[PDB]
Design an enzyme around this catalytic site. Structure first.
Site, PDB file in Angstrom:
ATOM      1  N   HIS A  85       8.581  -5.178   8.383  1.00  0.00           N
ATOM      2  CA  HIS A  85       8.771  -3.856   7.762  1.00  0.00           C
ATOM      3  C   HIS A  85       8.097  -2.842   8.652  1.00  0.00           C
ATOM      4  CE1 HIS A  85       4.999  -4.933   5.585  1.00  0.00           C
ATOM      5  NE2 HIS A  85       4.778  -3.649   5.432  1.00  0.00           N
ATOM      6  N   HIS A  87       5.423  -0.680   8.427  1.00  0.00           N
ATOM      7  CA  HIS A  87       4.006  -0.334   8.443  1.00  0.00           C
ATOM      8  C   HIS A  87       3.344  -0.767   9.747  1.00  0.00           C
ATOM      9  CE1 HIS A  87       3.766  -0.037   3.774  1.00  0.00           C
ATOM     10  NE2 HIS A  87       4.089   1.121   4.306  1.00  0.00           N
ATOM     11  N   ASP A  89       0.747  -2.566  10.381  1.00  0.00           N
ATOM     12  CA  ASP A  89       0.386  -3.964  10.492  1.00  0.00           C
ATOM     13  C   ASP A  89       1.562  -4.843  10.947  1.00  0.00           C
ATOM     14  OD1 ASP A  89       1.271  -3.380   7.800  1.00  0.00           O
ATOM     15  OD2 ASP A  89       0.394  -5.297   7.100  1.00  0.00           O
ATOM     16  N   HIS A 150       7.230  -4.883  -1.634  1.00  0.00           N
ATOM     17  CA  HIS A 150       6.163  -4.146  -1.016  1.00  0.00           C
ATOM     18  C   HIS A 150       6.636  -2.885  -0.318  1.00  0.00           C
ATOM     19  CE1 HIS A 150       2.672  -3.382   1.582  1.00  0.00           C
ATOM     20  NE2 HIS A 150       3.562  -3.334   2.596  1.00  0.00           N
ATOM     21  N   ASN A 181      -1.592  -2.573  -0.770  1.00  0.00           N
ATOM     22  CA  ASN A 181      -1.217  -1.198  -0.502  1.00  0.00           C
ATOM     23  C   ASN A 181       0.198  -0.963  -1.003  1.00  0.00           C
ATOM     24  OD1 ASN A 181      -0.585   1.331   0.501  1.00  0.00           O
ATOM     25  ND2 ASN A 181      -1.893   1.013   2.321  1.00  0.00           N
TER      26      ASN A 181
HETATM   27  C1  LIG Z   1      -5.199  -0.256   0.156  1.00  0.00           C
HETATM   28  C2  LIG Z   1      -5.470  -1.744  -0.066  1.00  0.00           C
HETATM   29  O1  LIG Z   1      -4.500  -2.391   0.769  1.00  0.00           O
HETATM   30  C3  LIG Z   1      -4.542  -3.726   0.853  1.00  0.00           C
HETATM   31  N1  LIG Z   1      -5.368  -4.398   0.048  1.00  0.00           N
HETATM   32  C4  LIG Z   1      -5.384  -5.747   0.131  1.00  0.00           C
HETATM   33  C5  LIG Z   1      -4.600  -6.412   1.016  1.00  0.00           C
HETATM   34  C6  LIG Z   1      -3.708  -5.716   1.796  1.00  0.00           C
HETATM   35  C7  LIG Z   1      -3.697  -4.305   1.776  1.00  0.00           C
HETATM   36  C8  LIG Z   1      -2.788  -3.592   2.630  1.00  0.00           C
HETATM   37  C9  LIG Z   1      -1.433  -3.813   2.861  1.00  0.00           C
HETATM   38  C10 LIG Z   1      -0.506  -4.706   2.132  1.00  0.00           C
HETATM   39  O2  LIG Z   1      -0.702  -4.858   0.898  1.00  0.00           O
HETATM   40  O3  LIG Z   1       0.494  -5.160   2.738  1.00  0.00           O
HETATM   41  N2  LIG Z   1      -0.957  -2.971   3.817  1.00  0.00           N
HETATM   42  C11 LIG Z   1      -1.997  -2.147   4.256  1.00  0.00           C
HETATM   43  C12 LIG Z   1      -1.926  -1.094   5.194  1.00  0.00           C
HETATM   44  C13 LIG Z   1      -0.677  -0.726   5.951  1.00  0.00           C
HETATM   45  C14 LIG Z   1      -0.015   0.452   5.261  1.00  0.00           C
HETATM   46  C15 LIG Z   1      -0.901  -0.485   7.422  1.00  0.00           C
HETATM   47  C16 LIG Z   1      -3.158  -0.427   5.423  1.00  0.00           C
HETATM   48  C17 LIG Z   1      -4.317  -0.796   4.716  1.00  0.00           C
HETATM   49  C18 LIG Z   1      -4.323  -1.836   3.789  1.00  0.00           C
HETATM   50  C19 LIG Z   1      -3.129  -2.511   3.527  1.00  0.00           C
HETATM   51 ZN   LIG Z   2       3.168  -2.862   4.481  1.00  0.00          ZN
HETATM   52 ZN   LIG Z   3       0.782  -5.444   4.844  1.00  0.00          ZN
END
Ligand SMILES: CCOc1ncccc1-c1c(C(=O)O)[nH]c2c(C(C)C)cccc12
Ligand SMILES: [Zn+2]
Ligand SMILES: [Zn+2]
Length: 232
Positions: A85, A87, A89, A150, A181
């Protein structure tokens, strides 16, 4: 020393690999975002004498470190990458990959979203994935679009030779207490999309979340449960 890596066991700026099955590894890295530190996963699948990469290591420097770790531990070239996707990460590091000779791919939906977000953009578009339940082959994996979860564009990846289901960020680890997130999520559709995954991959033996520890098929039901409770 053999346990699944966590933030506490990955030296600063580093990447670790974890052998999941024959010819299948996860990659684990850590990144800071909004003043908190998070682990994330991706996948590596042997593709003859080459490797297919699923997802970046969440940033340019992490992704350079991933390539070095692959060279050290596996020693086969990464020739293609798929981002599951839009994002950071998943795509942050695509420019590093592209300058290392890796051909980068994502659905058109992911490419549009990445562009709109100001994130790095995979080069090549993956057609055949625009309707929920769609599946296409890509080297040694199957790519599956389960529907919005997600994110609206999230893909899952199956490795049929090993019965490994890489859920990406649509799937949460068993210790999760919140839906992570959810900024770009569809909480109402997410359970339906998970049910589609469960129906399509009933023989999965390992399920790998986008963040945190792999487990079995129970990660799917757990994910549905946590999402429904976040929405409630
Ligand atoms: C806010 C809490 O976020 C999470 N807390 C627990 C596990 C994963 C995350 C998280 C995820 C996801 O859930 O995939 N993506 C993120 C990004 C992406 C958008 C780059 C950034 C920061 C955190 C995350
Ligand atoms: Zn994501
Ligand atoms: Zn993620």
């Amino acid at each position: 020393s053999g346990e699944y890596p966590t933030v506490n066991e990955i030296p600063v700026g580093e990447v670790r690999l974890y052998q999941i099955a024959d010819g299948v590894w996860s990659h684990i890295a850590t990144q800071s975002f909004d003043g908190a530190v998070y682990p994330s996963n991706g996948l590596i699948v042997r593709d003859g004498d080459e490797l297919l990469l699923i997802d970046t290591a969440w940033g340019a420097k992490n992704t350079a470190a991933l390539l070095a770790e692959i060279e050290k531990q596996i020693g086969l070239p990464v020739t293609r990458a798929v981002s599951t996707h839009f994002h950071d990460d998943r795509v942050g590091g695509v420019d590093v990959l592209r300058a290392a000779g890796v051909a980068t791919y994502a659905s058109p939906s992911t490419r549009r979203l990445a562009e709109a977000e100001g994130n790095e953009i995979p080069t090549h578009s993956l057609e055949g994935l625009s309707s929920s339940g769609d599946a296409v082959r890509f080297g040694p994996v199957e790519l599956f679009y389960p529907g919005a979860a997600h994110s609206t564009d999230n893909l899952v990846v199956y490795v049929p030779s090993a019965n490994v289901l890489y859920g990406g960020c649509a799937v949460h680890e068993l210790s999760s207490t919140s839906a992570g997130n959810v900024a770009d999520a569809d909480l109402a559709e997410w359970p339906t999309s998970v049910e589609r995954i469960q129906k399509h991959y009933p023989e999965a033996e390992v399920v790998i979340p986008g963040h945190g520890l792999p487990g079995g098929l129970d990660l799917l039901q757990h994910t549905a449960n946590v999402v429904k409770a976040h929405k409630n």
